[PDB]
Amino acid sequence: AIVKCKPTSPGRRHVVKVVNADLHKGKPYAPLLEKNSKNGGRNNNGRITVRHIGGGHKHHYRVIDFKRTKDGIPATVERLEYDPNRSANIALVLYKDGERRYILAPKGVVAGDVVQSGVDAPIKAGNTLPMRNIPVGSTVHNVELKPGKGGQLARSAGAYAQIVARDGTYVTIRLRSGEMRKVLSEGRATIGEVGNSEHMLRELGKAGATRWRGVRPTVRGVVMNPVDHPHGGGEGRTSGGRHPVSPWGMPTKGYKTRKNKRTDKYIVRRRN
Amino acid sequence: MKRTFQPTVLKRKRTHGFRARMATKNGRKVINARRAKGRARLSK
Amino acid sequence: MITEERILKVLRAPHISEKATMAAEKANTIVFKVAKDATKKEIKAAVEKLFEVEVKSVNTLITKGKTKRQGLRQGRRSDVKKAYVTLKEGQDL
RNA sequence: GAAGACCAAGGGUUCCUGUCCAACGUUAAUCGGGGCAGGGUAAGUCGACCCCUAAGGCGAGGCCGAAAGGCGUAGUCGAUGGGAAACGGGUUAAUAUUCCCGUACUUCUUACAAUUGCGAUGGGGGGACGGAGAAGGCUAGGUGGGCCUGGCGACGGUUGUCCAGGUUCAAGUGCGUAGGCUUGAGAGUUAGGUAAAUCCGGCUCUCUCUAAGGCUGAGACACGACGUCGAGCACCUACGGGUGUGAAGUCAUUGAUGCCAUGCUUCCAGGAAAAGCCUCUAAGCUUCAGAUUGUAAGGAAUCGUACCCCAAACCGACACAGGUGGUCGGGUAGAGAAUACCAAGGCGCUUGAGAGAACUCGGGUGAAGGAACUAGGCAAAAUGGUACCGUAACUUCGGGAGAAGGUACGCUCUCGACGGUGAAGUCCCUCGCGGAUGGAGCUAUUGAGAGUCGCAGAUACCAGGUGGCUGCAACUGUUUAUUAAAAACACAGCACUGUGCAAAAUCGUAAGAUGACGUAUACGGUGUGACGCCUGCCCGGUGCCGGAAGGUUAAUUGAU
Numbered sequence A: 001a002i003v004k005c006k007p008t009s010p011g012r013r014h015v016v017k018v019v020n021a022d023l024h025k026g027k028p029y030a031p032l033l034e035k036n037s038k039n040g041g042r043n044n045n046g047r048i049t050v051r052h053i054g055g056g057h058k059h060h061y062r063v064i065d066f067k068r069t070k071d072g073i074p075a076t077v078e079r080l081e082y083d084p085n086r087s088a089n090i091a092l093v094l095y096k097d098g099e100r101r102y103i104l105a106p107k108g109v110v111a112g113d114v115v116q117s118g119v120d121a122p123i124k125a126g127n128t129l130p131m132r133n134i135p136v137g138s139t140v141h142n143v144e145l146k147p148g149k150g151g152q153l154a155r156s157a158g159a160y161a162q163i164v165a166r167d168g169t170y171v172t173i174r175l176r177s178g179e180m181r182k183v184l185s186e187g188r189a190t191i192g193e194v195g196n197s198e199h200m201l202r203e204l205g206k207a208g209a210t211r212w213r214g215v216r217p218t219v220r221g222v223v224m225n226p227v228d229h230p231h232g233g234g235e236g237r238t239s240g241g242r243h244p245v246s247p248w249g250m251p252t253k254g255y256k257t258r259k260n261k262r263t264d265k266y267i268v269r270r271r272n
Numbered sequence B: 001m002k003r004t005f006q007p008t009v010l011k012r013k014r015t016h017g018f019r020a021r022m023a024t025k026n027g028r029k030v031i032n033a034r035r036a037k038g039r040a041r042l043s044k
Numbered sequence C: 001m002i003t004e005e006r007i008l009k010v011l012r013a014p015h016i017s018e019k020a021t022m023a024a025e026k027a028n029t030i031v032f033k034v035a036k037d038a039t040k041k042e043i044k045a046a047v048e049k050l051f052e053v054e055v056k057s058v059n060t061l062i063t064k065g066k067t068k069r070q071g072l073r074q075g076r077r078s079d080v081k082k083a084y085v086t087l088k089e090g091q092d093l
Numbered sequence D: 001g002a003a004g005a006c007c008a009a010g011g012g013u014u015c016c017u018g019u020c021c022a023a024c025g026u027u028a029a030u031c032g033g034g035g036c037a038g039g040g041u042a043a044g045u046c047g048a049c050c051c052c053u054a055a056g057g058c059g060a061g062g063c064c065g066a067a068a069g070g071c072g073u074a075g076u077c078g079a080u081g082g083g084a085a086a087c088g089g090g091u092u093a094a095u096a097u098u099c100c101c102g103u104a105c106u107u108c109u110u111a112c113a114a115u116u117g118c119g120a121u122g123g124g125g126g127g128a129c130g131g132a133g134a135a136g137g138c139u140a141g142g143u144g145g146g147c148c149u150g151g152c153g154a155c156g157g158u159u160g161u162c163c164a165g166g167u168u169c170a171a172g173u174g175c176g177u178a179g180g181c182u183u184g185a186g187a188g189u190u191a192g193g194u195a196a197a198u199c200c201g202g203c204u205c206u207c208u209c210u211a212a213g214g215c216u217g218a219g220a221c222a223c224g225a226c227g228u229c230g231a232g233c234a235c236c237u238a239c240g241g242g243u244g245u246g247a248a249g250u251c252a253u254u255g256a257u258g259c260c261a262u263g264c265u266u267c268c269a270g271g272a273a274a275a276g277c278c279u280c281u282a283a284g285c286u287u288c289a290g291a292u293u294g295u296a297a298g299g300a301a302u303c304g305u306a307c308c309c310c311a312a313a314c315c316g317a318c319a320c321a322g323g324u325g326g327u328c329g330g331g332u333a334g335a336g337a338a339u340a341c342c343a344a345g346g347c348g349c350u351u352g353a354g355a356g357a358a359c360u361c362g363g364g365u366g367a368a369g370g371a372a373c374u375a376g377g378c379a380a381a382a383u384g385g386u387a388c389c390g391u392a393a394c395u396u397c398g399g400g401a402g403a404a405g406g407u408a409c410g411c412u413c414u415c416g417a418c419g420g421u422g423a424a425g426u427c428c429c430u431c432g433c434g435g436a437u438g439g440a441g442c443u444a445u446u447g448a449g450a451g452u453c454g455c456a457g458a459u460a461c462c463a464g465g466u467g468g469c470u471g472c473a474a475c476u477g478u479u480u481a482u483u484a485a486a487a488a489c490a491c492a493g494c495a496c497u498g499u500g501c502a503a504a505a506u507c508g509u510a511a512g513a514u515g516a517c518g519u520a521u522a523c524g525g526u527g528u529g530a531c532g533c534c535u536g537c538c539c540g541g542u543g544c545c546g547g548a549a550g551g552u553u554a555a556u557u558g559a560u
Helices: A197-201 A207-212 B009-016 B018-023 B025-037 C004-010 C018-027 C040-051
Strands: A002-004 A016-018 A075-081 A090-095 A100-104 A128-130 A139-141 A161-167 A170-174 A180-184 A188-191 A267-269 C011-014 C029-034 C055-063 C080-087
Touching (some): A016 A197, B009 B018, C011 C040
Antiparallel strands (some): A139 A188
């Protein structure tokens, strides 16, 4: 739920919190945790390759079944859990054979619910069929681009794709971008939308809250010196003195940067 | 006031030590250079 | 298995000292200057064989050598390993 | 709450003793961190080494690269983290959890005995962990009583309800308490844990399910300890000692920031890893080898150990008003680790002696006035506590607010009201580290009244000046190390835009990386900058996006 914090301090005044009562208060399921050190946006060269990343809380990576290939065997949602490694929540499912796993927790799914994968799987939330076995019009998430590879599209909190058409060995999906693209029908997708849609209604309220999420501050180009940024320089506030560019001179405000060509055949309509 | 030399032995060795010099081509160049100069101390 | 050659190299000299004298008088401990390589086991063997005594304990330390100036040229004296060898009660060396 | 005592680092003999005083030492020096010589550092248990891993490093093959090399797999290194075990006392000129005394604990090897499926690089478990808050239980330590020993007063008084000092001891073992966690028991079974599994996970049946079993566990108590310590005396002088022998050794209260507690509650930002360890089997071995439990015998190496550490020994050229991580923290007062005065302990800061000019520095007071000073109240002065009373505009309803401004405040007595702890005795016991029950003793809080001294009772130290109008920036933050701390940066929020995942983007020749083990509620760039009301007109220019008809146009081709 969405809760506005009472202004007992500046720093609290404009906080809006997503508080989910259904999330498990205890410790996560230890067999599915891995270490997840932070890199501060530095690469193997040790250089900052991505700006404005640094700090935040230590958190373990939870291992999610994005593949969902354990067909036939039903699984019951033991609990929903907070996953620090993503916006969505994760469900801990128990298979009838006593395997436990984490899945991306779909919208209306709660402890006790049964999920199943495979071609026979009923068309209900959390179930994973091959998209050829999923009726046209249906909303799905955790969509595979390559069969067997595991879900890659529609995994963010509140995300989902809709199957728009089916022609041959491809289905056309509409992604949250608005892009329409062909995907191989053999690829799996899970029925329904990812949960935690209220994620977008949060309001951090204060500087430090961003810092808790491991985001360092962004300095604007216009307040740097010309040696530092094409928008640097000037006496008094300026607008950059030029068409907006990145730190590396690349045109921002409109300039398209997609250059794939390999994958253009799969894109039916662009998001625009 | 905190001055620039804040010695630790380990950091001295790992940076300027013999095994550090010997690990890299350019480090070995330094050792050879110092050995040619006649330097009593090749490494720190 | 300590050889006799080893046994004859381990103990370098007795150590003469107010402290050594006290040790001998009070705690039945003979202080030797032992070889740097010497181990407490080798030292016990050597003391037993070469003095026909029964050793209770061997404690060893290394004294690091003093730097000395000697006019212009500074230089260090050599490190000495000493062994405090406690003889069993009744035994004299 | 250090100018004391320790430790790490860093240094490296500066340590202790004798001797010397040239130089060094801001003077002299008999002294010294100086010179010279001699001595001094004792470990199964501390630390290193070692086993284990983090970031990260290196990296067989590999991938990539003119060469040099770069990246990286298997690996192997890498603590700042995980992993066995020792305390009390005594002793040196100088070490001591290391020597000695007392009394422990850990682990390994070998041999032997009795039981006996053993076996991992694999499975499962465990190890194993966040921030904040709170209540409770303890203990150290403090204080007082009692006790023991001594005292009976340099000047009135001081045989007392008087004075002073003391009133010691741990690990460990036993025990299993306050507290914490967890239902157990027995059957039958198996879509799982890369194979296997008797282990784990799952399922089914019964039974039990505030419970009572297990696990954990401060502290208490017993032992350790008829030892040790102990004021005091005895006792040798060499005048330093040495040995010798030694009283009481309890109770109450208070009480940690230490312990139970890696707990409990709660929150979001969701909280190392790996090994040791337990268990399970596999391949493999089955008079074996191994395993377990026990009993002997033996081992546990090596390296560090001096000394300095709010520093004259480290970093600052100096015996430099600076810097330097961690631990310990007594009394009175006090909320307190503030502050004042003291303890333990340590120092008087390595030039002194005079004098009592100007002027400089740091302070104290000041007639009358009171900002007239000045760029500017700069600096000073002032305010300063607690309890209660009382408090405006405005407001985002939190604030503003300690607004403002008042009153009381010492000490003595009297009458009161109360909290904690909990003795004896009593009574139940499911008889113990158990319950009531009881109030002695101890200790704390507080009200009212009366009185009394002084210029003054928050008496010192300590300790907000306040209010009004207005610009700017929402706010806490950040910055020009060393002339700028701000209105500058950031910021939450907003918007545009890129980006469909082999994402964009960035580092890189490449491989490979980050992005992200993320996936459009995401990620990157750009601007704006909480919040409220809003955000007009112009697409000519220049961007960017789209469109392609035509025109122009490269390599190429090669007609003439």
